[PDB]
Amino acid sequence: SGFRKMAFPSGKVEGCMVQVTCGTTTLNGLWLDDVVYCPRHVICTSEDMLNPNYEDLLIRKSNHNFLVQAGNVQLRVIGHSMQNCVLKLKVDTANPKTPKYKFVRIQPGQTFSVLACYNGSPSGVYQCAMRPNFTIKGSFLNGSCGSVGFNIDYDCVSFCYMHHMELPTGVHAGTDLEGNFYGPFVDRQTAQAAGTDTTITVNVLAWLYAAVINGDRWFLNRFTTTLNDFNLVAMKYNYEPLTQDHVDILGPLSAQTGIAVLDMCASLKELLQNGMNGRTILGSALLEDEFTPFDVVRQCSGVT
Amino acid sequence: SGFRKMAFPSGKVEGCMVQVTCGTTTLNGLWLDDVVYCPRHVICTSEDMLNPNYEDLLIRKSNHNFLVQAGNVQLRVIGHSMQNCVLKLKVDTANPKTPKYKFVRIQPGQTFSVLACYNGSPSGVYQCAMRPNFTIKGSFLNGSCGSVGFNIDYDCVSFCYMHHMELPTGVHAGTDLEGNFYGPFVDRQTAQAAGTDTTITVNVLAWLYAAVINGDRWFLNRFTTTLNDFNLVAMKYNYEPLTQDHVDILGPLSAQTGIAVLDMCASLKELLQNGMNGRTILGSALLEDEFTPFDVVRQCSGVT
Ligand SMILES: Cc1ccncc1NC(=O)[C@H]1C[C@H](C2CC2)C1
Numbered sequence A, B: 001s002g003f004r005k006m007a008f009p010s011g012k013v014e015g016c017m018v019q020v021t022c023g024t025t026t027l028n029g030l031w032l033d034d035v036v037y038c039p040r041h042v043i044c045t046s047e048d049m050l051n052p053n054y055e056d057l058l059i060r061k062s063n064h065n066f067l068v069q070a071g072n073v074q075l076r077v078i079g080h081s082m083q084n085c086v087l088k089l090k091v092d093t094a095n096p097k098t099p100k101y102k103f104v105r106i107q108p109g110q111t112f113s114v115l116a117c118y119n120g121s122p123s124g125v126y127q128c129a130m131r132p133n134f135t136i137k138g139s140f141l142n143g144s145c146g147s148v149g150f151n152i153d154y155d156c157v158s159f160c161y162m163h164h165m166e167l168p169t170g171v172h173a174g175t176d177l178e179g180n181f182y183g184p185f186v187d188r189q190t191a192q193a194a195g196t197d198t199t200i201t202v203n204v205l206a207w208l209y210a211a212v213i214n215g216d217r218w219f220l221n222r223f224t225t226t227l228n229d230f231n232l233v234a235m236k237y238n239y240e241p242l243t244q245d246h247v248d249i250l251g252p253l254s255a256q257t258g259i260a261v262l263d264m265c266a267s268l269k270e271l272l273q274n275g276m277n278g279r280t281i282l283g284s285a286l287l288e289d290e291f292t293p294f295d296v297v298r299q300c301s302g303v304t
């Protein structure tokens, strides 16, 4: 028992972190096979970041200008290319610590772990969720760019995120491992405002099932609702609309606890309308939305 | 910016996790140098756990009864001994992945990361705090015993905890790496109730400084207090008494923000007396006490 914001073990990702320096900017790179992946804004100076033309900036850069260091040893750069907002540095040595890996572009609502890094060195690991406005509420300082987000299925690491920037509101923006930004953000020092940060309804429900499984049941009520009635309530409180796809994914949790999905929606509805009244659920005084139904099943079953 | 419940990177600890089987019980072991550390209750059967005599139980066990497997390879056991509530299995091979390490017995209020494991395999990593009642609010299922708690200083892993049991209240109990239980708990299937779980005052204050550093300032007030006045309030709300030692450790945070420690205590006092009034601090609707002043400084500076 006990329910925690758990991140994946980070060892397989630690073995891929390298430091990339270009000119006077140092950030993190991801070394997989003979390729180092890093944010293309590594080639920018402070003046360049206001309105950068990456194609023009990259012309003045050669393989020897990109300094890649893994631990205390230097990697020889034999090729460089730009793929959207990421640079791919072909090195002459394949990373001996390369795990089985995939590059996946996640959907908003999905969760992942972040290995925050500085100068190619890991500082910590935490669990995140891609917000419905395509931002992440991370913990990143200057030098953390190139830190990656990932999920693990037994031995395979699915890289889903690479950190690029902090918006003026302190929230974070970045790309998948193909260089495409999540959301409408661009890698430029310009004010870009985030859209409405709605709550991930299916995740809150999965977390409510995790609470029932672990003993916290006070919020269970004698009511039920319909998908349309629930969604009227969800709209009012800036919750994501729940679909039958979301109900389908909650199926294993509904089966284990014996509480029908719509019954849990009615409990969630009363919680939205009345609040917690000074009480807590899983040691939290607010409704947690950064546990997917898969994370709840994984944690409550002990998947390694 | 952004403030997250961050765990240490777990790679160095993943390389030490092994599976230990004795008879029909399988749990986790920690392989450092040529020694495997695991909970001594691995030698117990269900009937034994009610009132076990570990010295008597250990007499009927030989080196060959302890099956140690690291990944898919078997370790040869050449010695076994009991040190308090942990068994030390001398193996003929030193762990090639042994990091620089120390065994430390932490004080309540101190935080650490837990690499939850099942069958010698890591499932996840989360941040914990040793509660003032010597329990931990973890996330552990059957098979997770032997999972360890640790902190990291650059390259040195300080092992501070080894998981042993779940109390009937769903909270967790365990030992330091010398086999001594934190608190008054014994490794026996008997009801053992936890003491008052007070809030770690110095940690809440450190988290309030982290909130000011990251933009959340609404809770700052025009008041101040004294250590004795604050402690009257802290006693009422089951908060740990604050000492000048705690004030000393908050010094770097007080210096960075320019908010005197006692001024922050007055803000905390008003928060205890009035509540959050539906507001949040660092995305939390309750006062977080599992960030030490050291964790706040580390995260807010980017220590790797
Ligand atoms: C200062 C900081 C903190 C956290 N995360 C990231 C950063 N860095 C940035 O946001 C910088 C590089 C960005 C360029 C437009 C691409 C501006």
Ligand SMILES: Cc1ccncc1NC(=O)[C@H]1C[C@H](C2CC2)C1
Pocket (backbone or CB within 6 Å): A001, B041, B049, B140, B141, B142, B143, B144, B145, B164, B165, B166, B167, B186, B187, B188, B189
């Ligand atoms: C079932 C479980 C779940 C989480 N953590 C731990 C456990 N296991 C236990 O508490 C068992 C082994 C204990 C023996 C008295 C020493 C009883």
